Structure 1
Amino acid sequence: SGFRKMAFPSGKVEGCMVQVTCGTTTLNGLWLDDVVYCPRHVICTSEDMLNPNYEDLLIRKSNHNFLVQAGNVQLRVIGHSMQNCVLKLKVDTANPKTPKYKFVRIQPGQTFSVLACYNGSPSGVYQCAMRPNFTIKGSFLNGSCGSVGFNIDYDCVSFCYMHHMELPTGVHAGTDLEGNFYGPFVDRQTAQAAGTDTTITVNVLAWLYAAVINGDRWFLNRFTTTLNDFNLVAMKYNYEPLTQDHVDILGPLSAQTGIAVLDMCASLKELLQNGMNGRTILGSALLEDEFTPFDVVRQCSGVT
């Protein structure tokens, strides 16, 4: 019993973290095989940050200008190239700690673990969700760029995120491991609009199922609703519309608890319209949306 915001064990990713220095800027790199991946803004100066011409800036850089250090050993850079907003630094040594890995572009609403790093060294690990507006509510300081987000499937690490930026609003933006930003964000020190961030309904429902499995059942009511009636309430409260796909993914949790999805939707409807009245659910006084139905099943069944 118990329900926590659980991150994946970070060991396989710690063995990939390196420090990348270019000129006077230092950030984090991800060493997989003979390649180090890092944000391309490592080549910027504090003058270039407002609107950098990365192609021009990279042209003034040679392999010897990229200092890559893993622990205390220097890696020799034999190639460099820009792929979207990431630089791929080819090194002469394959990382002996390279785990079985994939590069995946996650969907909004999906979750992942972040290993925050500074100077190539891991400082902490936390669980995040890619918001519907493609930002993440992380915890990042100067030098955190190049820290990665990931998921683990037994022995395989799926890298989904690389940290690039913090918007003036305190929210975080970044790319997949091919350098494509999640959302409309660009890697330049400018004010950028993060759109309206909605609540991930399927995750709030999955977390209501986790609450039911872990003893918290006060919010359960004698009501039911329809997809269309529930969605009228979800629209008013800036919640993602629930689809039949979402109902289907909630199927295992519905079967385990014996509470139909639309019955849980009716409980959520009343929680939105009436609030919590000073009560809590799984130790929280608000509706949590950073646990997918997969996260709930995994935490409530103990998948290692």
Structure 2
Amino acid sequence: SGFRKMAFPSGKVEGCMVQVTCGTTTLNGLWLDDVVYCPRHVICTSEDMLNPNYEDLLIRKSNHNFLVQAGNVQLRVIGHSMQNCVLKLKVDTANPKTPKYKFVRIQPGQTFSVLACYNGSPSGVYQCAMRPNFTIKGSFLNGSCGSVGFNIDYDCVSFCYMHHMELPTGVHAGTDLEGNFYGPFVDRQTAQAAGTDTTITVNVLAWLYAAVINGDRWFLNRFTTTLNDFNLVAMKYNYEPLTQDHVDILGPLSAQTGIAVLDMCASLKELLQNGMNGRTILGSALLEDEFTPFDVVRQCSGV
């Protein structure tokens, strides 16, 4: 039946993207009700970026210094504040397309859709994971800042991510919609370290289950293992330690397949220890960790 990297439909979020301009800097804003959210570094100059005092930079700016463009229509800014690393622009006009929405801080290992935007126009949509080190493996060029990540909950959009920066590793960092960075990152042009990039173990198990449901079951061995024994081998390969919570989350996938979580851990252990010998699992020659159990169920149940 197939297994694919799948984003949520983007339409509800498309009608929320606007253009925000301050001096020479143009980027993306999120227009919900009568508030527009964007990265505060919209106020920064080329050289301000080395060590900006946002409080002093923001103080030289008034309502009329912000150009907020929905399509071809200019909105009137009647208020501004800084919340952490986001600028909230109060506007005269409530977005008539505002969907039912929430702001959530996502946890590491969870996935969301990114609607990649330039000049407040939606460009494309792809799925990302908040990696254990609070980075994402995105596709973000000059102009993409203010692009948002989100989940759809039948009708309700859960915004979880706003894009701010690229790290030397070719990897991306940003905030929740209250403007708190995921991870230790700051919005300034300085040397910044993402930690060691550990693998989301529960996600790899979900993906090996997806493989089995789709008839790909060569990597299944005659062995079994224990939490402590598997987790000794995880540690060696920079895998997140598997917990009983993780085992319980996988139970619907165990139940559907008839393969005990611990039997799947044994298979994973030998793949980690032996490699794949030029063989592939769901069209990949490496172990994929950017699918959650929910993602696997959703796609293998048809939500």
TM above 0.5: yes
1:222-263: per-residue Cα shift (whole Å, max 9, x none)? 110000000001000000000000000000000000000000
1:42-91 CA-to-partner distances (Å, cap 9, x unmatched) read: 00000101110000000000000100001110011000000000000000
CA-based RMSD of the aligned residues comes to: 0.4
Task: Give distance in 2, aligned partners of 1:70 and 1:168.
Answer: 33
Query: What CA distance in whole angstroms lies between the structure 2 residues aligned with 1:300 and 1:245?
Result: 21
**Equivalent residues in 2 for 1:25-174 (5 A)?**
25-174=25-174
Q: Within 2, Cα distance between the matches of 1:191 and 1:6?
A: 33
CA distance in 1, matches of 2:229, 2:4: 31
Deviation at 1:221, TM superposition (A): 1.1
Give 1:167 deviation, angstroms.
1.2
| Unaligned segments of structure 2, at least 5 residues | none
- d(CA) in 1 for partners of 2:270 and 2:98? 49
Q: TM-score, normalised by structure 1?
A: 0.99
- Tell me the distance in 1 between the aligned counterparts of 2:210 and 2:168: 35
State the SS of the aligned residue for 2:49: helix
Counterpart of 2:6 in 1: which secondary structure?
coil
Partners of 1:27 and 1:222 in 2: how far apart?
55
For residue 41 of structure 2, give the secondary structure of its aligned residue in structure 1: helix
For the residues of structure 2 that align with 1:215 and 1:7, how far apart are their CA atoms?
A: 24
**1:223 match: secondary structure:** coil
CA distance in 2, matches of 1:167, 1:65: 30
Deviations 1:95-135 (A, max 9, x none): 01101100000000000000000000010000000000001
> How far off its partner does 1:191 sit?
1.1
- Structure 1 Cα separation of the partners of residues 97 and 223 of structure 2: 54
User: 1:152-174 CA deviation, whole Å, 9 max, x = no partner?
Assistant: 11000000000000112211000
Gaps of 5+ in 1: none
Q: What is the distance in 2 between the residues matched to 1:169 and 1:207?
A: 25
What is the CA–CA distance in structure 1 between the aligned matches of 2:118 and 2:5, rounded to whole Å?
A: 23
Q: Give aligned-pair identity as a percent.
A: 100
How much has 1:199 moved relative to structure 2? 0.3
For residue 217 of structure 1, report the CA deviation from its aligned partner: 0.5
* Aligned mates of 1:12, 1:190 — CA distance in 2: 36
Query: Which 4+ residue blocks in structure 1 deviate beyond 4 angstroms?
Result: none
Aligned to 1:23: 23
Give the total of aligned pairs: 303
Distance 2:168 2:187 in 1: 13
Q: Tell me the distance in 2 between the aligned counterparts of 1:53 and 1:136.
A: 27
Distance 2:73 2:170 in 1: 35
TM-score by length of 2: 1.00
Counterpart CA distance in 2 for 1:293 and 1:266 is 18
Residue aligned with 2:282, SS: coil
Deviations 1:205-232 (A, max 9, x none): 0000000000101111111000000000
Could you say what secondary structure the match of 1:266 adopts? Answer: helix
- 1:168-212 CA-to-partner distances (Å, cap 9, x unmatched) read 221100000000000000000111010001000000000000000
